[PDB]
């Protein structure tokens, strides 16, 4: 059902986010059952169709490599990008993982030897972030994880929705710049939840899945397929070509700097919920074909967890994060209503402002520091539920592990690293041992 | 079977939460569908969960509880309709809003 | 021309503005960095307030007014004498409605006040500096404009009740002693800023706090 | 009293904008009490009872001379008037700040601290009265039927301070005002002196919520 | 240093032009903007210098 | 000559007594903390 | 003795964020211009 | 320069993976520089580095 639900349904924002999509749902038909082989082949028959649709493979005019000096696979994802990763990735790790992946081997290059094919590609994520840093920053908090995106154009009227026209797009950006507490809690009276709708429903995303079945969607595929004026560089709209143009044009003059290279390392760092690292348990992984004749267990359903919460801290962290933020009165008494243990509130910013020193030389009192870092290194702990065959244990190494074993669909394969290679790590490792 | 378990029974129904704001949770301001209130024409508008509740904080001076909102609309009679689109969201399970 | 910062701009002066015999107070669009927007007729939001500062600027607003009350009730005769009334090519011609254009209600900053600690520094201010020497009509704008900013919001809480707010001041500050450069009035008050300014616009003779 | 002491020494000693959000809560918490519990010792000397520990109206009851068994019987009836339904147990639990039995009355007094005078009057008797009075015809019904040789006679008063004292005198006519009213201008003073001096200038708005939580 | 020369001479010429083009105080403004650490005037001076 | 020299500069124009710095090895809010704690005085004078 | 007590130390040393930036402060560029001979000879041939 | 570049390899060998061969060079450095810290400063100025 996903499968074959995961071609037709156009989200329409962009190459970035409708590649996201396509494989983030072929990662959810993977959870329910599908061979990991299945998965792979929608993961690649989706990326062929979206780099059609948006011109991105080579052969036609969106082609990143005919408008940048960087290779086709280490082009940013929001650029023309290769979205080809094997499905252990999409699963395991994530779905904006290439970004990741990528920063940190620019990063790694850029030391040892100072070469210009990596800073170009610094200047590249440098450029993204700029273009990202023009919108609602509440974006980037939530959903898929990026270090910058480019953004498109919306083909809908917003007199659809009755109460779109209510605030001002303008009055909407200054509340929440004003208001930044309200990107990690819920208000809870009229007066600010009333906005916060209101800034809820002029969201791209949300209106996109508003008017996900309407004959308005054709409007923006044509638009796209016509190669007209579709993202955005600067207050005005622009070709996509014109955006390639411009990362050329910004990345080849770009400088590094001390405080970028600090942040660039901030992206690359560790996060502040305990991720297993994906990346080198695959890369000194082994698999070992077995010659035992293929068994059909049962089914059984598993809660495949990849992102925790320390333990350290008592509170949620978008609970110590708001109230951190909360300068008003009422913004306290919602952060206050919200967190579990209210009287420790101190206590965990305290943790989190320690910890943040101690792994960098970041110092979260200032606001803009707190504000900018905070989404980067604070992401959600949204739970999957995994359709497994046999004795699989509730845990994220066994899912993994069972997807491995799962790759052949006739022959046994045995993983020769049998131990626990499980890799829990958060900002906060020493703070005990301190 | 269930007076065995009058204490956890308790507890689970007070731990539903009744006495948070309505519109607060997730689920009342999410891309459901919802009936809107009837038109000049009389014909029932086919609307959202959000716009519904951005209608009724725009009306209202407070954001009510579940209790309290169950008691300001008591006396409003129950409507229904059926869709204008099918499904239109992964969330949107059934025929009726 | 592209890649101007016109977010990067600030004013020290007064920047003055004439149409058709309109009058107009540019500081708080440049200090809010609407600049680019006032320019090139681009949408913004402006908070009323700012809005009334940036039509009219010549007459105070009721922040000032509530404060020369509260001084009243604290001692008069040491008043603001008050006279004034209350409350690449790119061509503008309407730049009232385009102000106009950018008003909106709820965009403001809000600042958690302390109602003892107002009344506290109303009259350490009333006590140290004589206001009724110089005329506040003849005051420069660029200043009258910070001293009502920081003192906004403060006849709001004290006006209302105010006797039993002295008697609680009196009982803080006669029982244990209290350091007149600690009261914190409200969120957004430095007290080093504020004694400048108002050292700078009242003047007071040096020779007797030294001799 | 040395409570008071005991905050003084503890207070003295912290500089102006030392103190996180939540000790600044609990120290006035702890000066309301003592406020409260001055006021309550202003009554007990007034009174001359030297009950120092509070008593459930229970053992009010018992020290009245009430049999156990009616008591027994009663705790399983509830009050019709409650707001929330509580049942007569749990009213038997509480404990009033002061009682004193003369003969076959009993007064029961409820004392509260605060600017609002009307506000806490009203609130201390909907917690009260509706249970006495009920507890009053109880006892009358028993006195009826036989089980009582003479009738109870319950009494209610409840007296409101202001933080000022300025109309202590006109409600308790009593001796010792003066003393008592300088004591608790002392501890208004304190209590504004640790609201609105040694709070952080960051958590002002941190101690205004939890202050409205708590107490509003 | 450059690159900071530059912004400050194009946002002159920006605030310049506007001025042109309607009825501006020139001079008045000149006095009273200010960028980075140096008011528009002794940017002016500078570009002279 | 000292003295007079202090009585010509703070006589013209208007010196502030928080920005007077004595030597290099001086801050205003300790030295007048200090003052205060060693030598109290009534508050009610500078707020009555 | 030295010796032992360097790898004691070293055996529990925890990484910093200020001890990685005094780190690169040893590793990163002078105050002298300074020829990058170690590249140069990296990178060069010699031929007979 | 021999030490430099050691320190250099380390510093690169503790990006990219974080292993313990190389933060124990890191740590000798460290001991090295905690020893250097208790005698006179202007021993480093000049002379070999």
């Given at each position: 059902?996903?499968?074959?639900?995961?071609?037709?349904d156009?989200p329409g924002l962009?190459?970035?986010d409708?590649?996201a999509a396509?494989?983030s749902r072929?990662?959810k038909?993977?959870?329910?059952?599908?061979?990991?082989?299945?998965?792979?082949?929608?993961?690649?028959?989706?990326?062929?169709?979206?780099?059609?649709?948006?011109?991105?493979?080579?052969?036609?005019?969106?082609?990143?490599?005919?408008?940048?000096?960087?290779?086709?696979?280490?082009?940013?994802?929001?650029?023309?990008?290769?979205?080809?990763?094997?499905?252990?990735?999409?699963?395991?790790?994530?779905?904006?993982?290439?970004?990741?992946?990528?920063?940190?081997?620019?990063?790694?290059?850029?030391?040892?030897?100072?070469?210009?094919?990596?800073?170009?590609?610094?200047?590249?994520?440098?450029?993204?972030?700029?273009?990202?840093?023009?919108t609602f920053q509440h974006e980037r908090l939530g959903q898929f994880s990026?270090?910058?995106?480019?953004?498109?154009?919306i083909?809908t009227p917003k007199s659809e929705f009755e109460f779109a026209d209510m605030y001002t797009s303008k009055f909407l950006e200054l509340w929440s710049s004003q208001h930044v507490t309200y990107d990690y809690i819920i208000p809870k009276g009229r007066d600010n939840l009333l906005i916060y709708l209101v800034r809820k429903l002029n969201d791209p995303s949300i209106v996109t899945a508003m008017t996900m079945q309407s004959?308005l969607q054709?409007?923006?595929?044509?638009?796209?397929?016509?190669?007209?004026?579709?993202?955005?560089?600067?207050?005005?709209?622009?070709?996509?070509?014109?955006?390639?143009?411009?990362?050329?044009?910004?990345?080849?003059?770009?400088?590094?700097?001390?405080?970028?290279?600090?942040?660039?390392?901030?992206?690359?760092?560790?996060?502040?919920?305990?991720?297993?690292?994906?990346?080198?348990?695959?890369?000194?992984?082994?698999?070992?074909?077995?010659?035992?004749?293929?068994?059909?267990?049962?089914?059984?359903?598993?809660?495949?967890?990849?992102?925790?919460k320390?333990?350290?801290?008592?509170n949620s962290i978008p609970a110590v994060i708001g109230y951190?933020f909360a300068?008003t009165v009422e913004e306290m008494s919602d952060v206050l209503d919200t967190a579990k243990?209210?009287?420790?509130?101190?206590?965990?910013?305290?943790?989190?402002?320690?910890?943040?020193?101690?792994?960098?030389?970041?110092?979260?009192?200032?606001?803009?520091?707190?504000?900018?870092?905070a989404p980067?290194?604070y992401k959600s702990s949204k739970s999957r539920?995994?359709?497994?065959?046999?004795?699989?244990?509730?845990?994220?190494?066994?899912?993994?592990?069972?997807?491995?074993?799962?790759?052949?669909?006739?022959?046994?394969?045995?993983?020769?690293?049998?131990?626990?290679?499980?890799?829990?790590?958060?900002?906060?490792?020493?703070?005990?041992?301190? | 079977?269930?007076?065995?378990?009058?204490?956890?029974?308790?507890?689970?129904?007070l731990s539903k939460n009744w006495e948070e704001p309505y519109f607060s949770q997730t689920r009342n301001i999410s891309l459901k569908g919802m009936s809107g209130q009837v038109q000049?024409?009389?014909?029932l508008s086919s609307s959202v969960t959000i716009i519904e509740a951005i209608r009724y904080l725009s009306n209202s001076r407070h954001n009510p509880s579940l209790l309290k909102l169950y008691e300001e609309t008591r006396?409003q009679k129950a409507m229904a309709r059926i869709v204008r689109k099918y499904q239109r969201t992964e969330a949107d399970r059934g025929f009726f809003i | 021309?592209?890649?101007?910062?016109?977010?990067?701009?600030?004013?020290?002066?007064?920047?003055?503005?004439?149409?058709?015999?309109?009058?107009?107070?540019?500081?708080?669009?440049?200090?809010?960095?609407?600049?680019?927007?006032?320019?090139?007729?681009?949408?913004?939001a402006?908070?009323?307030?700012?809005?009334?500062?940036?039509?009219?600027?010549?007459?105070?607003?009721?922040?000032?007014?509530?404060?020369?009350?509260?001084?009243?009730?604290?001692?008069?005769?040491?008043?603001?004498?008050?006279?004034?009334?209350?409350?690449?090519?790119?061509?503008?011609?309407?730049?009232?409605?385009?102000?106009?254009?950018?008003?909106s209600r709820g965009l403001?900053?809000?600042?958690?006040?302390?109602?003892?600690?107002?009344?506290?520094?109303?009259?350490?201010?009333?006590?140290?500096?004589?206001?009724?020497?110089?005329?506040?009509?003849?005051?420069?704008?660029?200043?009258?404009?910070?001293?009502?900013?920081?003192?906004?919001?403060?006849?709001?809480?004290?006006?209302?009740?105010?006797?039993?707010?002295?008697?609680?001041?009196?009982?803080?500050?006669?029982?244990?002693?209290?350091?007149?450069?600690?009261?914190?009035?409200?969120?957004?008050?430095?007290?080093?800023?504020?004694?400048?300014?108002?050292?700078?616009?009242?003047?007071?003779?040096?020779?007797?706090?030294?001799? | 009293?040395?409570?008071?002491?005991?905050?003084?020494?503890?207070?003295?000693?912290?500089?102006?904008?030392?103190?996180?959000?939540?000790?600044?809560?609990?120290?006035?918490?702890?000066?309301?009490?003592?406020?409260?519990?001055?006021?309550?010792?202003?009554?007990?000397?007034?009174?001359?009872?030297?009950?120092?520990?509070?008593?459930?109206?229970?053992?009010?009851?018992?020290?009245?001379?009430?049999?156990?068994?009616?008591?027994?019987?009663?705790?399983?009836?509830?009050?019709?008037?409650?707001?929330?339904?509580?049942?007569?147990?749990?009213?038997?639990?509480?404990?009033?700040?002061?009682?004193?039995?003369?003969?076959?009355?009993?007064?029961?007094?409820?004392?509260?601290?605060?600017?609002?005078?009307?506000?806490?009057?009203?609130?201390?008797?909907?917690?009260?009265?509706?249970?006495?009075?009920?507890?009053?015809?109880?006892?009358?019904?028993?006195?009826?039927?036989?089980?009582?040789?003479?009738?109870?006679?319950?009494?209610?008063?409840?007296?409101?301070?202001?933080?000022?004292?300025?109309?202590?005198?006109?409600?308790?006519?009593?001796?010792?005002?003066?003393?008592?009213?300088?004591?608790?201008?002392?501890?208004?003073?304190?209590?504004?002196?640790?609201?609105?001096?040694?709070?952080?200038?960051?958590?002002?708005?941190?101690?205004?919520a939890?202050?409205?939580?708590?107490?509003? | 240093?450059?690159?900071?020369?530059?912004?400050?001479?194009?946002?002159?010429?920006?605030?310049?032009?506007?001025?042109?083009?309607?009825?501006?105080?020139?001079?008045?403004?000149?006095?009273?903007?200010?960028?980075?650490?140096?008011?528009?005037?002794?940017?002016?001076?500078?570009?002279?210098?």
């Amino acid at each position: 059902k996903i499968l074959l639900g995961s071609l037709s349904d156009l989200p329409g924002l962009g190459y970035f986010d409708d590649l996201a999509a396509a494989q983030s749902r072929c990662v959810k038909a993977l959870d329910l059952g599908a061979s990991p082989q299945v998965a792979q082949l929608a993961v690649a028959l989706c990326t062929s169709k979206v780099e059609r649709l948006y011109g991105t493979a080579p052969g036609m005019v969106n082609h990143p490599a005919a408008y940048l000096q960087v290779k086709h696979t280490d082009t940013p994802i929001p650029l023309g990008g290769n979205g080809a990763m094997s499905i252990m990735e999409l699963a395991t790790a994530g779905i904006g993982m290439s970004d990741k992946n990528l920063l940190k081997r620019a990063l790694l290059g850029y030391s040892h030897k100072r070469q210009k094919s990596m800073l170009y590609i610094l200047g590249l994520f440098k450029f993204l972030m700029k273009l990202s840093d023009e919108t609602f920053q509440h974006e980037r908090l939530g959903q898929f994880s990026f270090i910058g995106k480019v953004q498109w154009k919306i083909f809908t009227p917003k007199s659809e929705f009755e109460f779109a026209d209510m605030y001002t797009s303008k009055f909407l950006e200054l509340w929440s710049s004003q208001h930044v507490t309200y990107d990690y809690i819920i208000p809870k009276g009229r007066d600010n939840l009333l906005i916060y709708l209101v800034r809820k429903l002029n969201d791209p995303s949300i209106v996109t899945a508003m008017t996900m079945q309407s004959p308005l969607q054709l409007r923006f595929r044509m638009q796209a397929k016509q190669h007209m004026k579709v993202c955005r560089l600067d207050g005005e709209w622009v070709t996509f070509r014109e955006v390639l143009a411009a990362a050329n044009s910004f990345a080849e003059n770009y400088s590094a700097t001390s405080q970028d290279m600090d942040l660039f390392q901030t992206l690359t760092s560790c996060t502040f919920s305990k991720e297993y690292a994906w990346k080198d348990f695959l890369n000194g992984i082994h698999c070992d074909v077995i010659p035992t004749k293929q068994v059909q267990r049962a089914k059984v359903a598993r809660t495949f967890t990849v992102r925790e919460k320390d333990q350290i801290i008592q509170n949620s962290i978008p609970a110590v994060i708001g109230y951190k933020f909360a300068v008003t009165v009422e913004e306290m008494s919602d952060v206050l209503d919200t967190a579990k243990f209210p009287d420790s509130l101190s206590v965990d910013l305290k943790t989190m402002k320690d910890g943040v020193y101690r792994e960098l030389g970041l110092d979260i009192s200032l606001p803009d520091v707190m504000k900018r870092i905070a989404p980067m290194l604070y992401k959600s702990s949204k739970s999957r539920v995994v359709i497994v065959q046999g004795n699989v244990e509730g845990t994220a190494e066994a899912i993994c592990r069972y997807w491995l074993k799962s790759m052949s669909l006739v022959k046994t394969i045995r993983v020769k690293p049998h131990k626990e290679v499980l890799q829990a790590v958060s900002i906060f490792n020493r703070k005990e041992d301190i | 079977v269930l007076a065995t378990k009058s204490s956890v029974v308790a507890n689970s129904i007070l731990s539903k939460n009744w006495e948070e704001p309505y519109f607060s949770q997730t689920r009342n301001i999410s891309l459901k569908g919802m009936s809107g209130q009837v038109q000049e024409d009389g014909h029932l508008s086919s609307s959202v969960t959000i716009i519904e509740a951005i209608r009724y904080l725009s009306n209202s001076r407070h954001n009510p509880s579940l209790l309290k909102l169950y008691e300001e609309t008591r006396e409003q009679k129950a409507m229904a309709r059926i869709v204008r689109k099918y499904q239109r969201t992964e969330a949107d399970r059934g025929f009726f809003i | 021309i592209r890649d101007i910062r016109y977010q990067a701009v600030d004013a020290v002066s007064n920047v003055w503005f004439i149409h058709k015999g309109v009058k107009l107070y540019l500081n708080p669009i440049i200090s809010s960095g609407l600049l680019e927007n006032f320019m090139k007729n681009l949408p913004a939001a402006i908070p009323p307030a700012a809005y009334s500062l940036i039509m009219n600027r010549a007459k105070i607003s009721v922040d000032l007014f509530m404060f020369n009350d509260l001084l009243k009730l604290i001692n008069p005769r040491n008043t603001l004498d008050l006279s004034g009334l209350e409350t690449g090519i790119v061509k503008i011609l309407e730049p009232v409605r385009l102000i106009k254009s950018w008003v909106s209600r709820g965009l403001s900053i809000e600042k958690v006040y302390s109602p003892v600690n107002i009344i506290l520094m109303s009259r350490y201010i009333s006590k140290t500096f004589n206001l009724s020497t110089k005329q506040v009509s003849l005051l420069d704008p660029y200043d009258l404009t910070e001293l009502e900013s920081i003192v906004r919001g403060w006849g709001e809480c004290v006006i209302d009740q105010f006797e039993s707010l002295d008697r609680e001041a009196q009982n803080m500050v006669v029982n244990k002693g209290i350091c007149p450069e600690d009261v914190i009035p409200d969120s957004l008050f430095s007290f080093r800023h504020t004694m400048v300014l108002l050292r700078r616009l009242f003047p007071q003779d040096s020779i007797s706090s030294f001799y | 009293m040395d409570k008071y002491r005991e905050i003084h020494n503890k207070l003295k000693e912290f500089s102006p904008g030392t103190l996180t959000a939540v000790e600044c809560i609990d120290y006035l918490d702890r000066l309301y009490a003592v406020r409260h519990d001055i006021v309550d010792q202003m009554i007990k000397h007034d009174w001359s009872d030297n009950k120092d520990s509070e008593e459930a109206i229970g053992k009010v009851l018992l020290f009245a001379g009430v049999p156990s068994n009616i008591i027994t019987a009663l705790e399983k009836k509830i009050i019709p008037n409650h707001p929330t339904g509580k049942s007569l147990k749990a009213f038997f639990k509480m404990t009033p700040d002061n009682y004193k039995i003369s003969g076959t009355t009993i007064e029961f007094v409820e004392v509260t601290v605060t600017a609002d005078v009307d506000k806490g009057i009203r609130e201390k008797k909907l917690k009260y009265e509706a249970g006495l009075t009920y507890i009053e015809q109880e006892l009358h019904k028993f006195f009826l039927k036989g089980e009582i040789p003479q009738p109870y006679k319950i009494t209610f008063n409840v007296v409101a301070v202001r933080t000022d004292g300025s109309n202590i005198t006109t409600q308790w006519p009593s001796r010792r005002n003066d003393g008592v009213v300088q004591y608790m201008r002392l501890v208004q003073a304190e209590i504004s002196y640790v609201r609105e001096h040694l709070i952080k200038t960051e958590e002002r708005a941190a101690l205004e919520a939890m202050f409205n939580l708590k107490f509003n | 240093g450059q690159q900071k020369d530059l912004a400050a001479l194009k946002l002159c010429i920006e605030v310049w032009r506007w001025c042109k083009a309607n009825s501006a105080p020139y001079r008045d403004w000149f006095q009273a903007l200010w960028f980075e650490d140096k008011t528009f005037s002794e940017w002016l001076d500078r570009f002279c210098r």
